[PDB]
């Protein structure tokens, strides 16, 4: 079981919207009850998705109402995190954690343009 | 889940010899397997992780192996202190799962039990019940027969026994059998006897007393 | 580090089991704080964790009824299991792991939690004394509920020759165990032998000296 990231590094503009990608292999119909997905960065929980249901009560303050997972695309083996209105605090190492059968994690480094 | 099936459920090995404990995963885990040791009344103790490498302090004779779905813990030069339940864990995917465990017994030479009988206490008798206890101390193997006799009458259905886990120093068992009677039933007989049969005894031994 | 579980030993069916784990030492900064339980006659069942990020995981077998939380200001994390049944009688372990994909490598002692409608009842303690060169003494700890009961000898200074047997379930629904010690007969007139009995669920503490 290997989770794959198409991009090692995002460089984003201040105030933009971004969508970072995580691929994980699915075979032919997602078994939602077996899927576990966490998006975090380095003490902070962004997404908690365990055995088919989300729990945002775990989400950190920084990302409140701003970052969300896109659920229809889970069918495609795609776990995409969607960060709205990026700022310089969102810069940092992000990490995807996916368990479906086996489990793996990948890191992605993010840089945010100064204004202008 | 990934089911981890251990084999065997239990094994008996002599000292200085080798014991083999298998743990089989229901799907590829490739090497995310750990081994643990749990001595009686103690928390589990990590022995191996990544399926062949030892934790710090774990002696050399504990060796893990395998990859894919087949994993094996090998304990060489078996020591008395190695009595424990040994079990595996997979951390390849969630939820983490454990093998149900393998109980390792030490085989050793036969040891006859020392037998003791205890009358009921005057304090307990005041409460209306009499408990007669028979002790079988430091014997091997575990198989032992306790027969209660009361005025030469063979007792049935009125006794319970329990056995200690194998001792980690001398590899023996101990056994306690309790005969429970009403005060009334107790006062109506004289000779209370415990007859022990064990492969270490050339003939059954009987310890007894007389009420009063 | 060092993990210490706490909470009730008895919970009535359909209520919510609440437990607490007090985390000390190196384990304070370990990334994942887990809960594991062991139902009698069953393999270990992984319950879930809470992470240093505040994120939680719970086994799908239990997700509906389980809530894991933490309080870093006291160095604790908790487990709440609702609508408990007899299937939830288990020894509950708290335990740590370094990473998200690492073995559960440090375990607490674990605490037994029984689910039952029966009331707590403290035990009665009776001496075990005979009516050779080696003599046997003991204490009978009778008619208590629930498990466990702890017995030591001479406040923990005497461990050699001590056998504390597994508790036995009587037909009354109460438990009974005996703890014995073998000693030189040449010490009976000069050394004291005292069993220390503690039944925490009933807050019973008894020191009983047993003589010759």
Q: What is the Cα–Cα distance from C149 to C141, expressed in whole angstroms? A: 8
| CA-only gyration radius of chain C, Å | 21
A79 neighbors A97 (Cβ within 8 angstroms)? no
Q: Give first-to-last CA distance, chain A, whole Å.
A: 42
Please list the helix, strand and coil fractions of chain C in percent, rounded to the nearest 5, in that order. Answer: 10, 50, 40
Contact B176 C106 (CB under 8 A): no
Q: How many other C-beta atoms are found inside a 10 Å radius of the C-beta of residue B55?
A: 15
Q: How many other C-beta atoms are found inside a 10 Å radius of the C-beta of residue C83?
A: 12
Sheet hosting strand C17-24, strand order edge to edge: C2-6, C17-24, C76-81, C66-71
Half-sphere exposure of A94 (CA within 13 A, CB side): 29
Reference B144, options B165, B173, B122, B106; nearest CA is: B173
Q: What is the Cα–Cα distance from B99 to B88, expressed in whole angstroms? A: 5
Confirm or reject contact between A101 and chain B (CB < 8 A): yes
Resolution (A): 2.0
Reference C207, options C188, C190, C194; nearest CA is: C194
**φ and ψ at C41, to 5 degrees?**
65, 25
**Residues counted in chain B:** 212
C45 neighbors C37 (Cβ within 8 angstroms)? yes
**Residue B116: which residues within 8 A CB-CB, separation 6 or more?**
B134, B135, B137, B207, C130, C135, C136, C180
Q: Which two tokens stand for residue C191?
A: 């050394």
Contact A99 B27 (CB under 8 A): no
Own/partner pairs for B7-13, CB < 8 Å, 24+ apart?
Answer: B7/B102, B8/B102, B9/B100, B9/B102, B9/B103, B10/B102, B10/B103, B10/B104, B10/B105, B11/B102, B11/B103, B11/B104, B11/B105, B12/B104, B12/B105, B12/B106, B12/B107, B13/B78, B13/B104, B13/B105, B13/B106, B13/B107
Q: Beta C10-11 vs C111-115: how paired, if at all? A: parallel
Q: Which two tokens stand for residue B102?
A: 């393998």
Half-sphere exposure of C48 (CA within 13 A, CB side): 27
Residues of chain C positioned with their CB less than 8 A from the CB of A48: 55-56
Q: What is the Cα–Cα distance from B69 to B23, expressed in whole angstroms? A: 8
Residues of chain A positioned with their CB less than 8 A from the CB of B28: 102
Task: State how far residue A102 is from chain B, nearest Cα, in angstroms.
Answer: 4
Q: What is the Cα–Cα distance from B122 to B193, expressed in whole angstroms? A: 19
The secondary structure of residue C61, as a DSSP letter, is T
- Cis check: omega of the bond before B95, within 30 degrees of 0: yes
CA B12 to each of CA B70, B141, B143, C146: distance values in angstroms, whole numbers, following the listed order: 22, 11, 14, 33
Contact B92 A103 (CB under 8 A): yes
Residue C48 DSSP SS3: strand
Reference C142, options C199, C193, C181; nearest CA is: C199
Q: What is the Cα–Cα distance from B95 to C35, expressed in whole angstroms? A: 12
> In which residue are the tokens 């202190």 written?
B81
CA C179 to each of CA B26, B142, C73, C141: distance values in angstroms, whole numbers, following the listed order: 43, 19, 41, 8
Query: What domains lie within chain C, and their CATH numbers?
Result: 2-115 (2.60.40.10), 124-210 (2.60.40.10)
Give the residue on C whose Cα is nearest the Cα of B164: C165
Number of structural domains in chain A = 1
Q: What is the Cα–Cα distance from A33 to A101, expressed in whole angstroms? A: 11
Q: Which two tokens stand for residue C159?
A: 């461990």
- b or e along B120-129 (b: 16 or more beta carbons within 10 Å of the residue's beta carbon)? bbeebbeeeb
Neighbouring subunits of B (3+ Cβ pairs under 8 A): A, C
Q: What is the Cα–Cα distance from B40 to B38, expressed in whole angstroms? A: 6
Q: How many other C-beta atoms are found inside a 10 Å radius of the C-beta of residue C209?
A: 12
Residues of chain B positioned with their CB less than 8 A from the CB of C32: none
- Cis check: omega of the bond before B141, within 30 degrees of 0: yes
- CA B176 to centroid of chain Cα atoms: 13
Residues of chain C positioned with their CB less than 8 A from the CB of A102: none
The secondary structure of residue B141, as a DSSP letter, is S
B14 neighbors B78 (Cβ within 8 angstroms)? yes
> In which residue are the tokens 């030069």 written?
B77
Confirm or reject contact between B125 and chain C (CB < 8 A): no
Q: What is the Cα–Cα distance from B65 to B156, expressed in whole angstroms? A: 50
Q: What is the Cα–Cα distance from B4 to B70, expressed in whole angstroms? A: 10
B25 neighbors B34 (Cβ within 8 angstroms)? no
B79 neighbors B93 (Cβ within 8 angstroms)? no
Indicate if the alpha-carbon torsion angle B158, B204, C128, C202 is positive or negative. Answer: negative
Q: What is the Cα–Cα distance from B37 to B46, expressed in whole angstroms? A: 7
Reference A51, options A4, A104, A98, A3; nearest CA is: A98
Give the residue on C whose Cα is nearest the Cα of B4: C43
B30 neighbors B68 (Cβ within 8 angstroms)? yes
Task: State how far residue C97 is from chain A, nearest Cα, in angstroms.
Answer: 16
The torsion region of residue B125 among left (phi > 0), alpha (psi -120 to 50) and beta comes to alpha
Q: How many other C-beta atoms are found inside a 10 Å radius of the C-beta of residue B174?
A: 24
Which helix (H) or strand (E) covers residue B123, if one does? helix B122-126
**Residues counted in chain C:** 212
Residue C80 DSSP SS3: strand
Q: What is the Cα–Cα distance from B116 to C183, expressed in whole angstroms? A: 12
The secondary structure of residue C123, as a DSSP letter, is P
Q: How many other C-beta atoms are found inside a 10 Å radius of the C-beta of residue C203?
A: 9
Q: What is the Cα–Cα distance from B66 to B123, expressed in whole angstroms? A: 60
Q: What is the Cα–Cα distance from C17 to C11, expressed in whole angstroms? A: 6
Q: Which two tokens stand for residue B15?
A: 């000292």
Residues of chain A positioned with their CB less than 8 A from the CB of C54: 45, 58, 60
Reference B20, options B78, B97, B67, B89; nearest CA is: B78
Q: Beta B102-107 vs B10-14: how paired, if at all? A: parallel
Of C107, C134, C163, which is closest to B43 when you measure between CB atoms? C107
Residue A34 DSSP SS3: helix
Q: What is the Cα–Cα distance from A41 to B55, expressed in whole angstroms? A: 29
Q: Which domain holds residue A5?
A: 1-116
The secondary structure of residue C165, as a DSSP letter, is P
- CA B199 to centroid of chain Cα atoms: 18
Query: What domains lie within chain B, and their CATH numbers?
Result: 4-107 (2.60.40.10), 114-210 (2.60.40.10)
B177 neighbors B194 (Cβ within 8 angstroms)? yes
Q: What is the Cα–Cα distance from B175 to B177, expressed in whole angstroms? A: 7
Contact A99 B29 (CB under 8 A): no
Residue C162 burial class via C-beta count within 10 angstroms: exposed 0-12, middle 13-18, buried 19 and up: middle
Q: What is the Cα–Cα distance from C42 to C112, expressed in whole angstroms? A: 14
**φ and ψ at C148, to 5 degrees?**
-105, 170
Residue C115 DSSP SS3: strand
B35 neighbors B99 (Cβ within 8 angstroms)? no
Residues of chain B positioned with their CB less than 8 A from the CB of C165: 162-164, 174, 176
**Residue C99: which residues within 8 A CB-CB, separation 6 or more?**
C31, C32
């Amino acid at each position: 079981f290997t989770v794959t990231v198409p991009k090692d590094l995002y460089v984003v503009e201040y105030g933009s919207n971004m969508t970072i990608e995580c691929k994980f292999p699915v075979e032919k119909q997602l078994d939602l009850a077996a899927l576990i997905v966490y998006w975090e960065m380095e003490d902070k929980n962004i997404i908690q998705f365990v055995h088919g249901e989300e729990d945002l009560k775990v989400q950190h303050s920084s990302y409140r109402q701003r970052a969300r997972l896109l659920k229809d695309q889970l069918s495609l083996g795609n776990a995409a995190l969607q960060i709205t209105d990026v700022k310089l605090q969102d810069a940092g190492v992000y990490r995807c954690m996916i368990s479906y059968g086996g489990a793996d994690y990948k890191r992605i480094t993010v840089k945010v343009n100064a204004p202008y | 889940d990934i089911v981890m099936t251990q084999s065997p459920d239990s094994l008996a090995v002599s000292l200085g010899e080798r014991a083999t404990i298998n743990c089989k995963a229901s799907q590829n885990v490739d090497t995310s397997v750990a081994w643990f040791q749990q001595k009686p009344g103690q928390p589990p103790k990590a022995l191996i992780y990544s399926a062949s490498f030892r934790y710090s302090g774990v002696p050399d004779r504990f060796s893990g192996s395998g990859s894919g779905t087949d994993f094996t813990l090998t304990i060489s030069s078996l020591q008395a202190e190695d009595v424990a339940v040994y079990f595996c864990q997979q951390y390849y995917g969630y939820p983490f799962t454990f093998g149900q465990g393998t109980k390792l017994e030490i085989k050793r030479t036969v040891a006859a039990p020392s037998v003791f009988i205890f009358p009921p206490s005057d304090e307990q008798l005041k409460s209306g019940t009499a408990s007669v206890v028979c002790l079988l101390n430091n014997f091997y193997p575990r198989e032992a027969k306790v027969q209660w006799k009361v005025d030469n009458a063979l007792q049935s259905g009125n006794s319970q026994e329990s056995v200690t886990e194998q001792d980690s120093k001398d590899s023996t068992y101990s056994l306690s059998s309790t005969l429970t009677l009403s005060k009334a039933d107790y006062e109506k007989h004289k000779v209370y006897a415990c007859e022990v049969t064990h492969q270490g005894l050339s003939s059954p031994v009987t310890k007894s007393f007389n009420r009063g | 580090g060092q993990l210490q579980e706490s909470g009730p030993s008895l919970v009535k069916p359909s209520q919510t089991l609440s437990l607490t784990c007090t985390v000390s030492g190196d384990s304070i900064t370990r990334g994942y704080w887990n809960w594991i339980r062991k139902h009698p006659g069953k393999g270990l069942e992984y319950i879930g964790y809470i992470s240093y990020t505040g994120s939680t995981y719970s086994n799908l077998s239990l997700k509906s009824r389980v809530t894991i939380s933490r309080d870093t200001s006291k160095n604790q994390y908790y487990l709440k299991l609702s609508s408990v049944t007899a299937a939830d009688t288990a020894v509950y372990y708290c335990a740590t792991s370094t990473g998200w994909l690492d073995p559960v490598d440090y375990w607490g002692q674990g605490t037994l939690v029984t689910v039952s409608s029966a009331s707590t009842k403290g035990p009665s303690v009776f001496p075990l004394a005979p009516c050779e060169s080696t003599a046997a003494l003991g204490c009978l700890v009778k008619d208590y509920f629930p498990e466990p009961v702890t017995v030591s000898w001479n406040s923990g200074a005497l461990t050699s020759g001590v056998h504390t047997f597994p508790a036995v379930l009587q037909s009354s629904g109460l438990y009974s165990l005996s703890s014995v010690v073998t000693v030189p007969s040449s010490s009976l007139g000069t050394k004291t032998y005292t069993c220390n009995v503690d039944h925490k669920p009933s807050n019973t503490k008894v020191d009983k000296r047993v003589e010759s």
